[PDB]
Structures are given as structure tokens and as C-alpha cells.
Design a protein around this ligand. Structure first.
Ligand SMILES: *[C@@H]1O[C@H](CO)[C@@H](O[C@@H]2O[C@H](CO)[C@@H](O[C@@H]3O[C@H](CO)[C@@H](O)[C@H](O)[C@H]3NC(C)=O)[C@H](O)[C@H]2NC(C)=O)[C@H](O)[C@H]1NC(C)=O
Ligand SMILES: CC(C)CCC[C@@H](C)[C@H]1CC[C@H]2[C@@H]3[C@H](O)C=C4C[C@@H](O)CC[C@]4(C)[C@H]3CC[C@]12C
Ligand SMILES: [Ca+2]
Ligand code: NA
Ligand code: NA
Ligand code: NA
Ligand SMILES: [Zn+2]
Length: 785
């Protein structure tokens, strides 16, 4: 019943006996002598010259006696002050080609150094503010920033780091959330979060344990000082082989707490950054002390950034809604609206939150209409009504929920939780160790990708997650995972002139009654259909398409627009022209009368007639197989994209290749719908209505080369535009399309990977680039930041 000899034990001693481990204070179960035996403080944390060779005093927090190296519990600077050694930060960086671990180490240990609220821009003030972190950054592997998940809150991001899952998949969709099945609420302050029912997926410490890899307990009670946390990881690393963990975790509540108090750019932020770097210095000094500084893989990682947010910048739903007392709001940098259950109508609530104030600093969303890149909808804990708060702003229920002590006060000057594309929300990643690359800069990536890497760093088979395994191979000098292209499931048909124009009774009227193009319009090979379906390849002068016979529309439409291409007007005799495609059966073609009968639905073309190379080739653009059902409100967005924006991108990027097509996601799970999951069709027909329309715009990273003659890395920008019957999302949609369309498309920017999940297609299968390069390209997100 005492902590003698079992201080910070890794053993699973539970209720009701008193424990002595990392979270005994959190579970309120420490033994009586835990503080006096395990949390010692005497003589501080740093050795002095007078303490060198001291008589061992069991009272002391750490020891400077000659025998302390044997015990593994020296102060982290013992060798520096006593044995005349240098600080790890003062040493010149030497490349770690192979792990230099003591005998008995079966794998290079992984220390995850989580820092709460560490903005990416905090690294700009380094070298002297953060000498130890700067050495890790410049001499290891770093990205300029790492993209967190939405919401950019602590618990959703830390668990995303641990599982590689979107919060909608691993369940921690917010710091606070309500589960209608549990009829209970989750909060980071409380005991309910310790209930395992809230945590889906498989975190890293569970993936490791299930595969015979010992994990140190990742979580530390706030009562434990950081020096004691580092000392405990160092003592754990001195355990025997059969007891020593292979993966550890240090969590710093800083610089989040000071960033919340003084804002990200405050001068009071350098002392916490110096404090964290001191802890980083203590870890590296301790590792070098244990001869582990060239054996351990250290990941310096943050969960999110920090934005200037003051209470003076708050939106109040009482200024929009008639009875906010009937509403439960998750307030702050994001908004989640629930029925309080004490006349609650989400349609009326959405309408009266939509573009009501001229500079409205939030936008309401039905969660299935949120930008798909956020992947924040497929969970019963995500409320149907969501508010995207503008950066630097808050949303609250009523004006009495804000709190300010003195005149014009605001207890906090910084906050986070915004859209994870926001640059202030970007956090840091530094990988230092034998498995990481030396002095290497990697492009920014999303924290959903780290779980795969940490599993690779530990020899672990990752649980199914939302990282693209292989996209971060360029961070590692050794790759345990070699990605392979998925097999094409459905082979394409290549129909000739099978049907006469006379056998068509589709109600279509038009006033006119091979590789040669693959080379030009299909630059990276045809997409692979990764599901069972019947579809045909259709060749034309200006575009190629994979036309689905089940969906009566192309799954994709590929075409290249040169830098010097010319945008022509639709000739007036062809304004309502839809010609039948003699290569496609009448039964597998759309009916033009179905669009007449459907008074809410119109139609558009995947390849734009505006970008036809000749008035003769323009007739192919009006084929029934280039036609997709489009709401007239969406046609405003699509026509502007097709007749102005594609040309603009071709003129800026020295030509572009465009792959456009429909997306069906009626259950908003981010995956392509089956035929039975499509909940809307064109009235009186089996023509399905897409929920989105994607486009993948690829060019040459070397803009001095045209898109069709590029012999190097590609540059991609993609979007998944919501196919909505109104433009309610765009508050300036009354104006010309040059004042709201491109802004709307930037908000719905997407990774090619997002489109692949949503379409069952695999792009970029025929390039001069390695597959790991392409996977990095597929996960790229053009943020417009
Ligand atoms: C992010 O990653 C998640 C985990 O990989 C994905 O969620 C998984 O979706 C799968 C398919 O919808 C589910 O898998 C199995 O589906 C078959 C259907 O044939 C069923 O028999 C199984 O019961 C079912 N899974 C089981 C046994 O639970 C997964 O359940 C589900 N996994 C999780 C953890 O949610 C997401 O789809 C992915 N997101 C995106 C956008 O790709
Ligand atoms: C208050 C803080 C200082 C510490 C908070 C700790 C808390 C978030 C941790 C402690 C134990 C964790 C669970 C445990 O490690 C095992 C599992 C099983 C795994 O399948 C899913 C995750 C889960 C439930 C962990 C969730 C996070 C917990 C409760
Ligand atoms: Ca779906
Ligand atoms: Na040919
Ligand atoms: Na119509
Ligand atoms: Na509008
Ligand atoms: Zn946090």
C-alpha cells in the first residue's frame, strides 16, 4: 500500500488499491506517500558544481552522485557540470545514418513530444529563443507547418495524431460533445472522458501493445512537473529489455496556456517557448547522458496553432435567433447547435443565421454541406447544424456568456478551433532521429498522416486510418512501407458507331438535324474505376470521358487547355442543343424530356463548349454523354468556372489539365455512394443527382514547361463543389460571378484523395513520377492562404 519502489510504475494496478503511476492523481488514487516518494523536489532539477560526487541523498529530486548513472536517475545536466561534457544543443549536428542504440534495444525508441497550441510561426523566433528545438528542426526532418484536423481543438487533434483518423471516425469530434446514444456529454474537464465508450479507432499505444510493442503510459497528471516527466521517461529508458517501453509521450500544456492568455504574437510568449525548449534541452541532455541521443526517434509535434482572439470579437446567436434559450450551442471558435429539448426547426434556424449581418463573421451549415475537406459530418456526435466561425472571432449564445473583469477586458487574447486551412491554426512537426532524414525540408502535410509514420517508426501495422500510407515516405531515410497502385476493378468499354441516330427517342433537339487525343487530354493516364461498374471510354477532339452506363453520365471528363487557348461563345443555334451519342445505347443515355419535366433541375456539360478548339469540334461538347444534371443556381458557379476560370488557370500555370465529374455522397460519409444510397434523381427518370462536382486541375510545377510537355513534378489544385439548388452559402452571390465564385471554390478546395474516396477513381496512374511522389501529390491541399 505504498509507492516505495513502484514510483511511476507501468503496471496495471487499478481499483480499489492505491496506484503510483502517471495518472494516479487524475483517477484520485495515489498512495499516501506518492508525493513524498515519487514527486521529490529537493535541490531542484539541475546539478551544481558543489553537488558533483555528492553522498547520495534519497530526498533529492535528482542525483549528482557518482552512482546515479547506474541508477539512471541523474539530473539531466549531470555530465555537463560534473564530467565536463557539453550540452546536446552546443554540439555540431552529425548525421545519424543508422541507430546507435545500446545493446538489447530491439527497435529505435520513439519519443512523441506533444506541445499544445504550438503555432507553426513560433519556429521563426528560434535559435536563441529555442536553441534545442531549432537544432532538432534544422538537423532533423521538418515541415514548414503541419495541418491539424477540424476542429483545431486539443482532444480531436491529439487523438487524430494517435489514430490517424478524422474526428468523425475516431469519435472525439470536439473537446466537448454530446452523444445521443449514450445520453451523456464528453468534456476535457471531468471523469467522463476516462470512459472508454467515447474513443473509437485504435490509438498508437493500443496498436503497439496489440503487436507486442511496449508503450509507456502517454498521459501525465498536471500535478507532475515537466522535469519529473522527462526524468521518468529517462528512468523508463533505463529499464531492462523486457520492461522498457519502445514508444513514449511527453505532453506540454504550453505554449497553449500562455497563447490563450496573451495571444500568439505577444512578447510574453518567449518565456514559455524558452521554458519548453529548456524541457527539450533536458530531454536531449538526458538522452545524450544515457547514450540515446543518436538512438531515439524524437517527434516534436503540435496539436494546433493559435489565433488572435479577444472577447471583443464575438458573434451572438441572440442577435440572429428568436429564442436562443431553446438552443444548446457549443460556443467559441466553432459552432454546434442542438435542440435543447427544453418549437425547434433546423431549417428555420439555418435560414435566419444565413447572411443576415453585412459582415457576418460566421457561416451556418448543415453538416453535410460543410466543405468536404473538413470530413466533419459522419458522426452522431456532430450536430446537424454547424457554424464556421471566421478566424480571429468567436460565436456565443447571448452577450452575457462573455466575461471581462475590468473595462474593455478580455481574460484571453488568443484561441483556436477554426477551419484547419487557416494559417494561424497550422502547427509544427519536427522529426529527429536515425529513421528520419537529415537536414531535410518536407512539404506541409496533414496530421492524419502521422499515425502511419509512427507505426512505420515502430515497425507496426497501422490500423485502418485516413492517412495515405506512403505519402510521407519522403520524411524517412528508411521506408518499411512500399505503396502499390490499387488494381483497376472495372475495365472500360470502347464502343464504336453501334446505334443509328434514328433509334433515339430521347426528346433531344439540336440545330444540326483514339490515343491521338489520349496524348493531349489524358496526360496522366485514364483514371482507374476501383468498383464494379459498366462504363465506356468516349474519345473526342477536345476531351475524353469515362461514361458510366449505370449513372448515365461520365464518371470523369479529362481535357487539356493550353496557355494560348481561346474561349469562344456558345453559338446561338446550339444554346439548347443536346445531340445523341451514337456510341451509347438509348437505354443508357439520359432523356432530355426528363430535364423538361424536372422544373427544378437543368443540365450542364463536364467539358465546356466554351473551350472547344473549332466550331466543328464544339458539337461533341453537346453530346448527351457530356451532360450532367445541374441546378440553375449551380450552373452559375459551373459556367463561370468553365468559361473564365479554366482559361485563367491555363494562362497562369502554362496550360492545365482538367478532370471533372460528379460526386454522389448522400450519407455524407466521404465515400462514393452505391446505387441504393442515391436519394435524388431527375424527376421521372433514373438519372441520379450528384451531391458534388469535382475538378482536378493539374499543370507543371516548373511553370516554364507547358502542362502537356512537363518532365518533372506536377502542381495540382482540386475542389469538390457542393451541388446545391441555391447559392445561400455565398452571401455575395447576388453580384457578378467574379465576386463570389472563386471565393466559394477556394473554400471547397480539396485533395485529390478526397475526390478518390468520393468517386472510387484512382488518378495519376501513368506519370514519370514515383508512386510515393504521386501519393504526396494526391494528399496536397491548395489552401489559398
Ligand atoms: C477514414 O478511415 C475509416 C477507417 O478506415 C473509414 O471508416 C471505415 O469505413 C468502412 C467502410 O465504410 C467500415 O468497414 C467495414 O465495411 C464492411 C462493409 O462490407 C462491413 O462488413 C464491416 O462491418 C465494416 N467495419 C467494421 C467491421 O466495423 C469501417 O467500419 C469504418 N471504420 C471506422 C474506424 O470508422 C472511413 O471511411 C475513412 N474516411 C474516408 C473519407 O475515407
Ligand atoms: C487529464 C489528463 C492529464 C489525462 C487524460 C487521460 C485520458 C485522456 C486517457 C487515459 C487512458 C486513456 C484510454 C486508454 O489508454 C485506452 C483506450 C483504449 C483504446 O482502444 C481507445 C482509447 C482509450 C479508451 C484511451 C482514451 C484516452 C484515455 C481515457
Ligand atoms: Ca457515401
Ligand atoms: Na489512333
Ligand atoms: Na428544368
Ligand atoms: Na446567396
Ligand atoms: Zn490543444
Amino acid at each position: 500500500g505504498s509507492c516505495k519502489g513502484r514510483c511511476f510504475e507501468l503496471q496495471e494496478v487499478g481499483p480499489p488499491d492505491c496506484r503510483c503511476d502517471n495518472l494516479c492523481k487524475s483517477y484520485s488514487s495515489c498512495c499516501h506517500d506518492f508525493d513524498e516518494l515519487c514527486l521529490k523536489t529537493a535541490r531542484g532539477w539541475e546539478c551544481t558544481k558543489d553537488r558533483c560526487g555528492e553522498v547520495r541523498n534519497e530526498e533529492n529530486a535528482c542525483h549528482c552522485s557518482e552512482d546515479c548513472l547506474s541508477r539512471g536517475d541523474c539530473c539531466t545536466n549531470y555530465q555537463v557540470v560534473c564530467k565536463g561534457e557539453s550540452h546536446w544543443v552546443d554540439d555540431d549536428c552529425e548525421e545519424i545514418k543508422v541507430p546507435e542504440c545500446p545493446a538489447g534495444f530491439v527497435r529505435p525508441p520513439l519519443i512523441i513530444f506533444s506541445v499544445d497550441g504550438f503555432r507553426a510561426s513560433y519556429m521563426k523566433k528560434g535559435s536563441k529563443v529555442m536553441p534545442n528545438i531549432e537544432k532538432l528542426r534544422s538537423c532533423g526532418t521538418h515541415a514548414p507547418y503541419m495541418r491539424p484536423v477540424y476542429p483545431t481543438k486539443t482532444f480531436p487533434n491529439l487523438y487524430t495524431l494517435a489514430t490517424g483518423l478524422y474526428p468523425e471516425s475516431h469519435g472525439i469530434v470536439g473537446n466537448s460533445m454530446y452523444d445521443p446514444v449514450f445520453d451523456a456529454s464528453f468534456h476535457l474537464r471531468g471523469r467522463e472522458k476516462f470512459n472508454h465508450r467515447w474513443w473509437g479507432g485504435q490509438p498508437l499505444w493500443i496498436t503497439a501493445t496489440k503487436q507486442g510493442v511496449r508503450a509507456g503510459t502517454f498521459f501525465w497528471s498536471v500535478s507532475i512537473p515537466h522535469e519529473r516527466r522527462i526524468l521518468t521517461i529517462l528512468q523508463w529508458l533505463s529499464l531492462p529489455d523486457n520492461e522498457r517501453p519502445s514508444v513514449y509521450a511527453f505532453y506540454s500544456e504550453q505554449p497553449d496556456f500562455s497563447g490563450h492568455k496573451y495571444g500568439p504574437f505577444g512578447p510574453e510568449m518567449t518565456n514559455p517557448l524558452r521554458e519548453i525548449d529548456k524541457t527539450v534541452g533536458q530531454l536531449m541532455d538526458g538522452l545524450k547522458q544515457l547514450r540515446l541521443h543518436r538512438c531515439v526517434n524524437v517527434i516534436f509535434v503540435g496539436d494546433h496553432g493559435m489565433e488572435d482572439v479577444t472577447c471583443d470579437r464575438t458573434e451572438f446567436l441572440s442577435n440572429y435567433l428568436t429564442n436562443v434559450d431553446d438552443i444548446t450551442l457549443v460556443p467559441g471558435t466553432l459552432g454546434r447547435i442542438r435542440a435543447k429539448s427544453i418549437k425547434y426547426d433546423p431549417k428555420t434556424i439555418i435560414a435566419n443565421l444565413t447572411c443576415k449581418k453585412p459582415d457576418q463573421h460566421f457561416k451556418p451549415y448543415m453538416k453535410q454541406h460543410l466543405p468536404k475537406r473538413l470530413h466533419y459530418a459522419n458522426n452522431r456526435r456532430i450536430e446537424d447544424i454547424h457554424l464556421l466561425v471566421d478566424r480571429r472571432w468567436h460565436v456565443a449564445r447571448k452577450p452575457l456568456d462573455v466575461y471581462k473583469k475590468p473595462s474593455g477586458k478580455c481574460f484571453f487574447q488568443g484561441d483556436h478551433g477554426f477551419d484547419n486551412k487557416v494559417n494561424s491554426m497550422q502547427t509544427v512537426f519536427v522529426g529527429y532521429g536515425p529513421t528520419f532524414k537529415y537536414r531535410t525540408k518536407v512539404p506541409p502535410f496533414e496530421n492524419i498522416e502521422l499515425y502511419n509514420v509512427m507505426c512505420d517508426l515502430l515497425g507496426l501495422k497501422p490500423a485502418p486510418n485516413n492517412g495515405t500510407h506512403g505519402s510521407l515516405n519522403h520524411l524517412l531515410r528508411t521506408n518499411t512501407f512500399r505503396p502499390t497502385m490499387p488494381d483497376e476493378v472495372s475495365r472500360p468499354n470502347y464502343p464504336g458507331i453501334m446505334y443509328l441516330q434514328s433509334e433515339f427517342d430521347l426528346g433531344c433537339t439540336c440545330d444540326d438535324k483514339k490515343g491521338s487525343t489520349k496524348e493531349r487530354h489524358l496526360l496522366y493516364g485514364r483514371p482507374a474505376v476501383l468498383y464494379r461498374t459498366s462504363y465506356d471510354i468516349l474519345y473526342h477532339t477536345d476531351f475524353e470521358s469515362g461514361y458510366s452506363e449505370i449513372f448515365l453520365m461520365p464518371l470523369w471528363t479529362s481535357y487539356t487547355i493550353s496557355k494560348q487557348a481561346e474561349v469562344s461563345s456558345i453559338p446561338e443555334h446550339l444554346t439548347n442543343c443536346v445531340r445523341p451519342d451514337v456510341r451509347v445505347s438509348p437505354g443508357f443515355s439520359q432523356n432530355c424530356l426528363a430535364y423538361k419535366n424536372d422544373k427544378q433541375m437543368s443540365y450542364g456539360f463536364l467539358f465546356p463548349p466554351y473551350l472547344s478548339s473549332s466550331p466543328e469540334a464544339k458539337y461533341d461538347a453537346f453530346l448527351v454523354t457530356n451532360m450532367v444534371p445541374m441546378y440553375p443556381a449551380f450552373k452559375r458557379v459551373w459556367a463561370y468556372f468553365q468559361r473564365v476560370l479554366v482559361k485563367k488557370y491555363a494562362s497562369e500555370r502554362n496550360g492545365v489539365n482538367v478532370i471533372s465529374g460528379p460526386i454522389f455522397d448522400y450519407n455524407y460519409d466521404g465515400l462514393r455512394d452505391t446505387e441504393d444510397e442515391i436519394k435524388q434523381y431527375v424527376e421521372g427518370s433514373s438519372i441520379p443527382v450528384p451531391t458534388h462536382y469535382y475538378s482536378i486541375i493539374t499543370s507543371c510545377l516548373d511553370f516554364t514547361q507547358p502542362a502537356d510537355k512537363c518532365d518533372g513534378p506536377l502542381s495540382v489544385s482540386s475542389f469538390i463543389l457542393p451541388h446545391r439548388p441555391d447559392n445561400d452559402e455565398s452571401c455575395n452571390s447576388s453580384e457578378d460571378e467574379s465576386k463570389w465564385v472563386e471565393e466559394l471554390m477556394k473554400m471547397h478546395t480539396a485533395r485529390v484523395r478526397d475526390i478518390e474516396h468520393l468517386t472510387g477513381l484512382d488518378f495519376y496512374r501513368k506519370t514519370s513520377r514515383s508512386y510515393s511522389e504521386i501519393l504526396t501529390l494526391k494528399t496536397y491541399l491548395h489552401t489559398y492562404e
